[model samples]
Target chain A: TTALVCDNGSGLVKAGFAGDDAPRAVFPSIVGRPRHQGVMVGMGQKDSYVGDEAQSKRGILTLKYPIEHGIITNWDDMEKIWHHTFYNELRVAPEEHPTLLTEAPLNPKANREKMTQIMFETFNVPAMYVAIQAVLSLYASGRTTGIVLDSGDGVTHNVPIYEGYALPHAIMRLDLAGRDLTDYLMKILTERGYSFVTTAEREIVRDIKEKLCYVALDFENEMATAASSSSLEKSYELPDGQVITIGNERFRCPETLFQPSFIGMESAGIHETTYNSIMKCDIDIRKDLYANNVMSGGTTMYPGIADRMQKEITALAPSTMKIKIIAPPERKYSVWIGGSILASLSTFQQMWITKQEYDEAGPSIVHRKCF
Target chain B: XXXXXXXXXXXXXXXXXXXXXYXXXXXXXXXXXXXXXXXXXXXXXXXXXXXXXXXXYXXXXXXXXXXXXX
Candidate 1:
């Protein structure tokens, strides 16, 4: 257990098992699926699917992404292949080893079913433990309560933790994630009628999204300074006079994530979503949980995740509120780490279900929950 | 899809829906909508007189929103 514990952020993640001597293996979440002659889709992911690596002789490799829309939607063939990726070609005894899968809060019942099915059906694992990704991060941080802000690929599910478990309904899922950011980029490109993304070029655009793109705290003020007549309002300049602009009439392309109003959508930004999620829950719990926020997920890797969340969330509430964004020791693999922690628990075995239970549990569970 | 005028790019009018502008109550939209001076066709922008919903109409885009299918 006393080995290397690497913190892989949205930009970078270290891959390993429950018991390991640091993640010797490196994996990416990005995938590139080459479509048509000049166009491709799955090009801009770090820890995603790639057909045949490096050996270009294998011909055009269409990327098979692991997770779709944050949750595994198209989970037929891709699910099988991608599931194996989590535990690639490893030979181990069930009792000798265990697994603790990481998931988000209010983890969808569908995802849970598929995940449970995969563990029991695919590899024939005996038992597995699953729970909120933030819970384990909080456990690892040794915090009783704090605001957990996890900016994952699809959405930033921020939860105000109490002692350990998150207050029901208090767990908020901010629909804004890296994918929403990508959607905005795709929109600008398509709206302008510019098909510059040639599979490979999309990777460039993604790179631009990560490196050059950022959240402008002053949403409107920044817009005026960077507004332009052309669709591509020159926002920032590169080293070589290559002025980068966005189609949304803003100086930068990925600037819409911070300001959803710029587009036609009438929804609150990430912080507001977090704010409303908190308010929707019981008020008794809300008062104590106000400042105890925790930030997790991949997007948390963006520079100043804690400071950015703190600045915005503080403005939403009373200035006197002791708001704090707990920075976990390892924000990226906090899920895996949390899963690993749960995996080591003795009572965790009670959570595991047999194949028979899985079959009957569906009808029974759904009916019971319905009533 | 509901353009008063037909798709005018082609020499022949393949779509029955599209029509050219005429002396109708509604104004023609932008560059696409223009008056077809061909006097051969009696196309008017105003709603064609309909007596009732039970009118004998030809088969259109397939949809079971209201009527029954044979």
Candidate 2:
């Protein structure tokens, strides 16, 4: 049987069948409906749109985000997105597959119960397994024990995974992540007389951040040299045919991840969080965890981010402590990629929470079977 | 949740499958207008993620177009 894997992110949902190198279907995690008129496909009732289709009709359609931070908040919209991804995007039969799902660190048992209930009671899949996202990211790098630093669209979390398990109490998190940086850039552009008249314009601003922003190797030094260098200057044209020149804003926007206080959010930077997590861990495993540090998520894609993290952690750690951060080329789907690896393993066959088990013990069985 | 030679920390050993971890590290994060402008007290729940198939009576149509298709 085939294995299905998915990483339901805050911004985009990364999904595909197992064995693929990367998620095959990527789309925004939103559903929308026109306020005045519903778009009809046939003689049946009108249907709400998803992703670009929904965003394209922003002025007419009311938008809804199902996942906030990393949690699935709106089941109805989330259900629609999952259906769209599986049936429309992947076109796979769930009944024919044993699915493996990645869950964010610190997810509530209540939520897991709900997810397990949905999988067995709703999709009727033969077997399912739920794994933590951070652990999976570590697995993506072929490491079983390490520190997983994940900065995605909604939140940034530093989790210390020891032997394939996350040390939950020591995990650190902050709200300053990709979406916030995008908003920061939007604020800067708006101050520069660029008016974002529509939500589509805001999306364009987000695209600008993704395409142009980078973390400075040295913030102050770069700031000083930027005044005399053209290297910091970039020109991007808006979707509405407006061209704008971006200077140091590229690095400064992503700088918020390192020095979150710069964005008016009081939280220690990613490095400090990672350092503190390691400190709170068992002393014997600190070096192993530090050396095997792995990073994943779309936000980590900012140029020089991994470099900046390496430098900061070095400065903060004791001498003789070696540190390395492994950020793969395809970091955004780390959780999904890891799931793909796990589901394909023959040893993982027994790990799947089967339909018979769910039917016997109910949804709570997930806590025991997949925990 | 079983550790080979675990530390002082409490572990959630999932039967013989004792490596997966689950727990909330809930923290505080609120965006303010400025360092002095303390507002937007909304709390951030930074951890809740999972994806899977659930029993459903129906599905989507023209699924092939969006499938590994254009």
Interface RMSD of each: 18.8, 24.1
Q: Name the runs in model 2 displaced over 4 angstroms.
A: A36-45, A55-59, B1-70
Q: Taking the tens digit of each residue's C-alpha lDDT, what string does model 2 give over A1-371?
A: 67888777578878877788888868887676544422354545445778666766666554555655666665656678877778887878779788777676665455566666777767889888777777677677788887777777766777887884546678877677676677667666665666664344556677786677777899889989897798788888775677888888777787777777666866677777778778887778788877887887778777787888878987998758788878788887777888888778888775677788876766656655554
lDDT of 1 by residue, A1-371 (tens): 22112222222334456555234454444343432233245545333233224123112433333453455434443454444334463334333334445555564555555555565666565444455656766775657776566776654666777774556656666566665566567557666454454334444455556554454556466656446334234354433346655543323343444566645465676778777877777667766666566666556656555666777778888787677766655766666565555555556556554445656664233223211
Residues forming the 10-long window of minimal summed lDDT in candidate 2 chain A: A34-43
Residue-wise C-alpha lDDT for candidate 2, range B1-70, written one tens digit per residue: 7544343222212221121211111111112211221111111121121122222212333453456663
Q: Candidate 2: TM-score? A: 0.78
Top candidate on TM-score is: 2
Instruction: Please give the distance, in angstroms, between residue A238's alpha carbon in candidate 1 and its true position after superposition.
Output: 12
